[PDB]
Amino acid sequence: HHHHHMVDEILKLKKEKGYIILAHNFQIPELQDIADFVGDSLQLARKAMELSEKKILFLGVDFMAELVKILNPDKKVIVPDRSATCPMANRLTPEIIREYREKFPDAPVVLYVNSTSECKTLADVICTSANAVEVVKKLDSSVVIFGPDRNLGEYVAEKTGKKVITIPENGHCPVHQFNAESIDAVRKKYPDAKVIVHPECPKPVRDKADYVGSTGQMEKIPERDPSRIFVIGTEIGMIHKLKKKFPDREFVPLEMAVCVNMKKNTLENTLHALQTESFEVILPKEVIEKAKKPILRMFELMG
Numbered sequence: 001h002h003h004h005h006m007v008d009e010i011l012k013l014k015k016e017k018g019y020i021i022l023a024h025n026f027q028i029p030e031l032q033d034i035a036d037f038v039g040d041s042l043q044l045a046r047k048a049m050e051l052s053e054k055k056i057l058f059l060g061v062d063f064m065a066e067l068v069k070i071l072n073p074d075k076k077v078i079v080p081d082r083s084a085t086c087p088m089a090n091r092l093t094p095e096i097i098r099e100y101r102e103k104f105p106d107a108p109v110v111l112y113v114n115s116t117s118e119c120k121t122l123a124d125v126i127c128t129s130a131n132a133v134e135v136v137k138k139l140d141s142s143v144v145i146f147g148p149d150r151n152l153g154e155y156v157a158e159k160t161g162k163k164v165i166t167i168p169e170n171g172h173c174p175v176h177q178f179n180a181e182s183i184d185a186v187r188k189k190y191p192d193a194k195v196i197v198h199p200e201c202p203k204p205v206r207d208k209a210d211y212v213g214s215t216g217q218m219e220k221i222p223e224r225d226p227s228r229i230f231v232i233g234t235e236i237g238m239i240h241k242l243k244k245k246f247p248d249r250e251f252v253p254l255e256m257a258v259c260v261n262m263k264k265n266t267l268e269n270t271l272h273a274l275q276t277e278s279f280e281v282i283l284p285k286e287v288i289e290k291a292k293k294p295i296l297r298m299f300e301l302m303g
């Protein structure tokens with residue numbers, strides 16, 4: 001195979017330098033295939049609390065890399081492309097959070113993991129799409145401030161029956177903005193398929209699906225549902241992961257959806273990352289000290 005040169009040197013350097021490679025489900029297939037651990041944000045977070053390796057090569061977006069570093073302040077965490085980021089996460093600011101706390105002083109601030117680390121210092125608790133409902137449901141308040149994703153926050157309100165005040169205005173992920181007409185069409189084409197969509201999808205898409213969950217939840221659905229075909233309403237990288245786990249099922253994208261930021265990581269720049277041991281994820285000590293609190297609380301409110 002024409003990529004063997006890069007694959008081989010990645011595997012040699014990883015072993016030589018004492019790295020573990022962690023990847024998100026939306027990384028390109030070639031990188032998922034060289035990673036030691038591939039999963040969703042919640043799975044990556046739990047892995048980050050548990051791993052023993054002194055050095056971590058993280059393959060995803062910056063807020064995830066930073067969470068891994070917050071949970072491992074004394075380990076070296078590197079990323080191939082320091083600009084890989086989540087634009088949705090980036091629209092929420094400290095300024096907005098403080099405005100809404102004042103406006104709603106007894107509402108806890110619940111931040112989606114897709115948020116800047118500075119913003120996380122201001123949060124009462126963090127959540128991911130897999131545990132957002134459980135986390136908010138276990139809080140002792142009928143109103144919560146939630147951001148940055150309006151769709152997830154609305155989904156939380158539905159499932160919990162609580163009032164969810166979303167910040168900022170119109171926070172959403174462009175990648176998950178499917179039209180519900182694509183489900184209609186796919187029902188005609190594959191009448192016995194099961195439709196699985198992300199909670200970041202708009203309400204009409206969520207409401208027409210058979211299942212709604214994080215990518216980690218998506219991967220467990222075929223363990224209990226015997227359907228021959230699943231239609232997947234998330235970023236394209238998940239198709240590879242699903243097909244690999246369940247080669248006897250068919251996985252069909254709801255629509256082709258690509259996260260440009262998740263695609264910034266390549267075999268070539270991942271090799272360079274191992275060769276140079278760059279770019280290190282560095283945070284102020286204060287940010288780590290402060291952002292760790294709502295991350296650890298997330299885990300307390302699961303069990």
Ligand code: SF4
Nearest residue numbers: 061086087173175259
């Ligand atoms: S798929 Fe959407 S929410 Fe996820 S990292 Fe990309 S832009 Fe952010």
